[PDB]
Amino acid sequence: TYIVSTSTAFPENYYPQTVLAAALRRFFTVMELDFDLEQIDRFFTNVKIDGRYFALPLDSLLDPPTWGVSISRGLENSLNLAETAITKLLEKTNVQPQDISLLASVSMTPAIPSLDGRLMNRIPFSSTLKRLPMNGVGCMGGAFGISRVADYLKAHPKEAAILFAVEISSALWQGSLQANLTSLIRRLSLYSEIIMDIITAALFADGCGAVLMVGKEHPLAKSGLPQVIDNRSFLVPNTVELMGLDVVGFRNILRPEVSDALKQGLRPLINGLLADNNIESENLYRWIVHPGGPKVIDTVEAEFGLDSQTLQLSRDTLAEVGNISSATVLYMLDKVLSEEQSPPDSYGLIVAMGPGLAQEAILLKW
């Protein structure tokens, strides 16, 4: 199974992290919330993000629209970004939509029917297009989706598939964060809850990524493209409460313990996958690690004894676009394929972590 090409799509408004921090400080100031505002600045700086794309508005932070309207805009933005990314992908590869056998999607955006079904009215896919709409995987979704498409293409060596991941984190800013922070600060053991919501506001951003993958018999399956040679999943027992998304609007759950609980899954997962492919982690030329946060990046480095430069792509990505959740690893893979040189027959590893607590690893070979 071969990764042939990638693309990304972002909304029009890129906000410097300092603008975002200032907007939230305005909110605390207007609502007379008793909390150190330097905590807002400290967390927005310490996540090491230079700016983020928000598809949904910031100008209405003090007067958010209704929940129904925010869901409607989030759905429309998700569809628009996904259409843009898919159309760029087909164009750069000169592939016709009718020649795509499977369209796989990941997104936390509420969509029944799913985003991939809706896109069939915007792009002239065949009416018998196979679809793989996935959810419940959060930040892990991009890596997760690549593994699922690879497993499909193992049985369909002649076919082509598109995976896309899109998330609208800015939906958080349409009332959920405002209400929750106001209530928590006013009742202030709740200090950690306020910190978590501030971290959520500092970290998460919007965007979309897409990947074209083909089986070994497809005409686009050529040497020098990354090959998915194996993949594996891991779920750490009894960690459901550490990460996820609770409907309340909604609240992002990201407990401080997450980075430590990752150690329980990372090495069992990756070391077992590599051993079963007769290589060691030190054989890997390229790591593509989802930047859940600065501490996640540091933990992966420590667990595998990596040099300070090996995960630089995770840090640069986080600086450039923030944590765009499931889409992040696709953006990163896009950077590798577009801007970087990969030695022939070198090995790469995609790693992502998300709610469950779950981790996903994909072994690549050029």
Catalytic residue numbers, as ranges:
139
In angstroms, give the least distance from the CB of 157 to a second copy: 10
Judged by CB, which is closer to ligand A1D7F: 71, or 337? 71
Instruction: Please give the Cα distance from 280 to 320 (Å, whole number).
Output: 31
Ranges of beta strands (E only) in 216-346 are: 227-235, 243-247, 250-254, 286-289
190 binds a second copy (CB under 8 A): no
* Residues with Cβ within 8 Å of residue 279, at least 6 apart in sequence: 347
In angstroms, give the least distance from the CB of 336 to a second copy: 25
Instruction: Please give the Cα distance from 252 to 196 (Å, whole number).
Output: 9
136 binds a second copy (CB under 8 A): yes
DSSP state, residue 56:
S
Report yes or no: 88 and 330 within 8 Å, Cβ to Cβ.
no
* Binds ligand A1D7F (CB under 6 A): choice among 110, 124, 157, 272: 110
Judged by CB, which is closer to a second copy: 108, or 364? 108
108 binds a second copy (CB under 8 A): yes
Judged by CB, which is closer to a second copy: 105, or 259? 105
> Residue 341 binds what, of a second copy, ligand A1D7F, none (CB under 5 to 8 Å, by partner type)?
none
115 binds a second copy (CB under 8 A): yes
Judged by CB, which is closer to ligand A1D7F: 243, or 311? 243
HSE on the CB side for 362, CA within 13 Å? Answer: 28
Pick the piece of the chain touching a second copy (CB under 8 A) from 55-63, 92-100, 113-121, 289-297: 113-121
> Residue 118 binds what, of ligand A1D7F, a second copy, none (CB under 5 to 8 Å, by partner type)?
a second copy
Judged by CB, which is closer to ligand A1D7F: 110, or 124? 110
Please choose, from the candidates 305, 296, 313, the residue with its C-alpha nearest in 3D space to the C-alpha of residue 348.
313
Pick the piece of the chain touching ligand A1D7F (CB under 6 A) from 15-23, 44-52, 144-152, 247-255: 247-255
Long-range contacts of 86-94 (CB under 8 A, 24+ apart): 86/7, 86/119, 86/123, 86/162, 86/164, 86/210, 87/123, 88/7, 88/9, 88/210, 89/5, 89/6, 89/7, 89/162, 89/210, 89/211, 89/212, 90/123, 92/5, 92/7, 93/4, 93/5, 93/212, 93/220
* Binds ligand A1D7F (CB under 6 A): choice among 85, 149, 153, 171: 171
Judged by CB, which is closer to a second copy: 33, or 71? 71
* Residues with Cβ within 8 Å of residue 59, at least 6 apart in sequence: none
DSSP state, residue 140:
G
334 binds ligand A1D7F (CB under 6 A): no
* Binds ligand A1D7F (CB under 6 A): choice among 167, 197, 301, 334: 167
Instruction: Please give the Cα distance from 64 to 131 (Å, whole number).
Output: 35
266 binds a second copy (CB under 8 A): no
Strands 227-235 and 358-365: antiparallel
Helix (H/G/I), strand (E/B), else coil: 50: coil
Instruction: Please give the Cα distance from 45 to 40 (Å, whole number).
Output: 9
Gyration radius from the chain CA atoms? 20
Contact pattern for ligand A1D7F over residues 186 through 225, marking x by CB under 6 A: ------------------x---------------------
Preceding-residue numbers of gaps in the chain (C–N over 2.5 Å): 188, 248
250 binds ligand A1D7F (CB under 6 A): yes
* Binds ligand A1D7F (CB under 6 A): choice among 7, 147, 169, 180: 169
> Residue 248 binds what, of ligand A1D7F, a second copy, none (CB under 5 to 8 Å, by partner type)?
a second copy
272 binds a second copy (CB under 8 A): yes
* Binds a second copy (CB under 8 A): choice among 146, 163, 236, 318: 236
Residues that bind a second copy (CB under 8 A): 66-68, 71, 105, 108, 110-118, 120-121, 127-138, 148, 151-152, 154-156, 232-238, 240, 243-248, 265, 268-269, 272, 354-358
